[PDB]
Ligand SMILES: CCCCCC/C=C\C=C/CCCCCCCC(=O)O[C@H](COC(=O)CCCCCCCCCCCCCCC)COP(=O)(O)O[C@@H]1[C@H](OC(=O)CCCCCCCCCCCCCCC)[C@H](O)[C@@H](O)[C@H](O)[C@H]1O[C@H]1O[C@H](CO)[C@@H](O[C@H]2O[C@H](CO)[C@@H](O)[C@H](O)[C@@H]2OP(=O)(O)OCCN)[C@H](O)[C@H]1N
């Protein structure tokens with residue numbers, strides 16, 4: 160890391176890239192809509208509590224590493240998969256390209272299908288929200304017949320579905336381990 | 344342009360006295376289509392292009408109506424911070440060809 | 448028998464748009480009266496939230512009328528406004544009252560009263576039971592106003608004060624007052640909460656409210672040398688000409704209203720002293736104008752544009768680093 164940063168200094172002989180990139184990621188100044196959880200929250204914020212809330216919502220990403228490493232000490236790759244999903248869900252400026260990476264891992268874990276519950280509804284909900292993003296964007300921005308509450312509701316539903324799906328996979332993993340050790 | 348003016352001198356006591364004031368009268372109507380003065384050598388317009396609430400364009404039109412002479416102009420624009428501009432999209436075209444500014 | 452030596456006035460309109468013509472008309476009528484009776488324009492702080500005289504919708508530009516006969520223009524030829532449409536807010540009004548104003552504010556926009564000053568305050572707008580609304584976004588409550596007046600009294604920034612409000616349920620706004628020497632008047636009581644609507648045809652809007660109309664009619668007969676007391680403004684606009692009932696609170700005030708003149712609060716009558724004393728006194732290069740648009744100098748004031756290229760040291764560093772890494776895993 161040190162060598163890369165020092166080398167980056169000498170392209171333009173300035174340290175200005177650093178606040179422009181990492182400060183932008185950490186402070187969330189731009190309020191452009193996305194599929195995340197930050198933009199509408201910080202466009203509708205009381206100025207007294209903004210610092211506290213930004214600190215909480217960026218600690219949330221780094222929060223889970225330690226207990227997950229305590230529980231999943233003998234299974235590092237499943238741990239990696241969960242961590243990547245968490246990063247994709249709770250980052251400041253998320254995109255579907257970040258979402259695709261952990262979805263690429265689902266075939267590795269599909270031997271856990273018998274212990275999965277409520278997989279069908281979650282898949283259907285994610286699929287529906289994906290199509291509902293562009294239609295409501297159009298109705299808000301070009302037709303003028305809708306407002307930002309529709310779009311905010313769709314983002315909320317999408318994130319909730321993602322969280323439920325990840326929790327289901329984690330539960331199935333633990334259940335299979337229990338049955339392996341103690342008997343079916 | 345050669346222009347002719349009529350002068351009323353208010354300090355002259357032939358013009359204005361204690362017993363008589365001044366009221367000037369002038370006959371003028373819009374001249375016929377013929378005999379109307381020609382348009383000025385320079386005028387301009389400005390408008391916004393596009394529709395929606397996401398992206399758009401700002402356009403300016405500059406006219407040179409002189410028959411045979413070209414002359415330079417200096418243009419100053421100020422835009423608020425909320426309308427974020429992309430300077431790699433700036434284009435200046437005259438008669439369908441690109442015009443390269445001397446100073447920017 | 449008053450004992451004051453100067454007069455001030457703060458008149459505020461807290462409405463918006465063009466269909467709220469009435470509030471601005473009321474404020475203009477008050478301004479016309481107080482100027483006619485003697486208060487100078489430097490001792491009046493006038494706040495108007497919107498412009499109705501030069502609004503492009505006005506069929507008669509630069510005029511504001513009180514009656515449909517159009518015989519009295521209350522905007523007038525001579526007028527000065529301190530706070531414009533976007534500087535009228537609850538916060539600025541409270542700053543003006545309490546003196547906690549930004550340091551760079553000019554003299555004309557601040558209230559510089561003292562122990563020997565009588566002050567008149569008038570307000571109008573859309574209100575409810577215990578609040579008055581500024582534009583549509585914010586409101587001021589009766590508690591805050593009662594606190595600001597005590598702040599003014601503790602520093603001795605007035606001698607006597609008169610407060611008048613023209614709103615629906617306006618009596619709620621003077622219920623919490625607790626400072627000495629304040630007299631308050633209102634147009635309607637707490638129950639009374641509807642408003643009239645009779646638009647004028649030629650102009651297109653409702654012109655003026657009833658109570659201020661009768662109050663301005665009683666101030667049009669009063670002259671600089673008048674002997675009218677404050678007991679005659681307590682009998683104006685009886686429920687029969689208005690449809691609501693005016694109120695007054697005069698238990699915080701020390702003098703009898705039968706001995707308080709109208710011009711003590713609406714005019715400026717000076718105390719004069721003849722002076723009879725005197726102090727003995729013993730008996731080569733010419734200058735030039737700038738050039739507009741010098742083309743060659745403008746062209747040469749900037750260095751020419753060359754395309755950007757990465758510095759060579761950065762390239763050397765990159766490739767040295769990469770090959771140094773490659774020589775570990777391979778050799
Ligand atoms: C599946 C599990 C889901 C997990 C969590 C759920 C998340 C999303 C799902 C459902 C929604 C819940 C959260 C939604 C809250 C915000 C969204 C909203 O309700 O707004 C409405 C959006 O419409 C929709 O929600 C549905 C449309 C499509 C979305 C589908 C939903 C998801 C589908 C995905 C999957 C489907 C199938 C899949 C299965 C296969 C738009 O309505 P509107 O704007 O008119 O109304 C608002 C507003 O209404 C509300 O928000 C409701 C309040 C509570 C909602 C929360 C729900 C409770 C629990 C939900 C249970 C879900 C399950 C969870 C368990 C798992 C609100 O009431 C008003 O406050 C708001 O303002 C109002 O807007 C309008 O109202 C005012 C009056 O018109 C106006 O105010 C102005 O005017 C006034 C003058 O009178 C003034 O006084 C005001 O000052 C003001 O200012 P003004 O002067 O006018 O200035 C104007 C300048 N522009 C507002 O202007 C006006 N906009």
Ligand SMILES: CC(C)CCC[C@@H](C)[C@H]1CC[C@H]2[C@@H]3CC=C4C[C@@H](OC(=O)CCC(=O)O)CC[C@]4(C)[C@H]3CC[C@]12C
Nearest residue numbers: 160161162163164165166168173174175176177178181
């Ligand atoms: C490798 C990781 C673990 C940290 C070590 C990297 C350092 C070589 C870098 C990372 C961040 C850098 C800092 C980021 C920002 C600034 C502010 C900067 O202040 C300015 O002058 C900025 C604005 C201006 O130029 O006026 C001075 C350099 C400094 C301290 C930088 C010094 C070099 C630092 C410590």
Ligand SMILES: CC(C)CCC[C@@H](C)[C@H]1CC[C@H]2[C@@H]3CC=C4C[C@@H](OC(=O)CCC(=O)O)CC[C@]4(C)[C@H]3CC[C@]12C
Nearest residue numbers: 160164176177178179180181182183184185186187188
């Ligand atoms: C892997 C471990 C060992 C270190 C990883 C690097 C980070 C700890 C460093 C690298 C660059 C740093 C940033 C470089 C520049 C700035 C800008 C500096 O000032 C700002 O402009 C803050 C933003 C704002 O308040 O608007 C505040 C800290 C911050 C975000 C730094 C926070 C810490 C960062 C992310």
Ligand SMILES: CC(C)CCC[C@@H](C)[C@H]1CC[C@H]2[C@@H]3CC=C4C[C@@H](OC(=O)CCC(=O)O)CC[C@]4(C)[C@H]3CC[C@]12C
Nearest residue numbers: 182185186187209210211213214215216217218219221
């Ligand atoms: C392993 C390292 C990254 C530490 C563990 C994560 C958190 C304990 C720290 C690390 C970086 C911190 C962030 C670095 C920079 C900022 C920007 C900072 O922005 C400002 O102060 C500007 C004004 C404002 O927006 O309130 C708010 C806190 C925040 C998000 C910090 C919140 C707490 C964070 C996430």
Ligand SMILES: CC(C)CCC[C@@H](C)[C@H]1CC[C@H]2[C@@H]3CC=C4C[C@@H](O)CC[C@]4(C)[C@H]3CC[C@]12C
Nearest residue numbers: 185186209210211212213214215217218221222
């Ligand atoms: C050490 C790491 C791994 C975990 C500790 C949490 C750190 C990163 C977080 C937690 C609380 C944060 C602080 C909370 C609030 C403020 C006030 C203001 O000045 C902005 C930065 C500052 C001072 C934050 C700096 C970063 C901070 C100290």
Ligand SMILES: *[C@@H]1O[C@H](CO)[C@@H](O)[C@H](O)[C@H]1NC(C)=O
Nearest residue numbers: 356357358359360361362363
């Ligand atoms: C202006 O007044 C003077 C003095 O009465 C008079 O002689 C003169 O004729 C008047 N104006 C004219 C007509 O010149």
Ligand SMILES: [Ca+2]
Nearest residue numbers: 488489491492
């Ligand atoms: Ca003034």
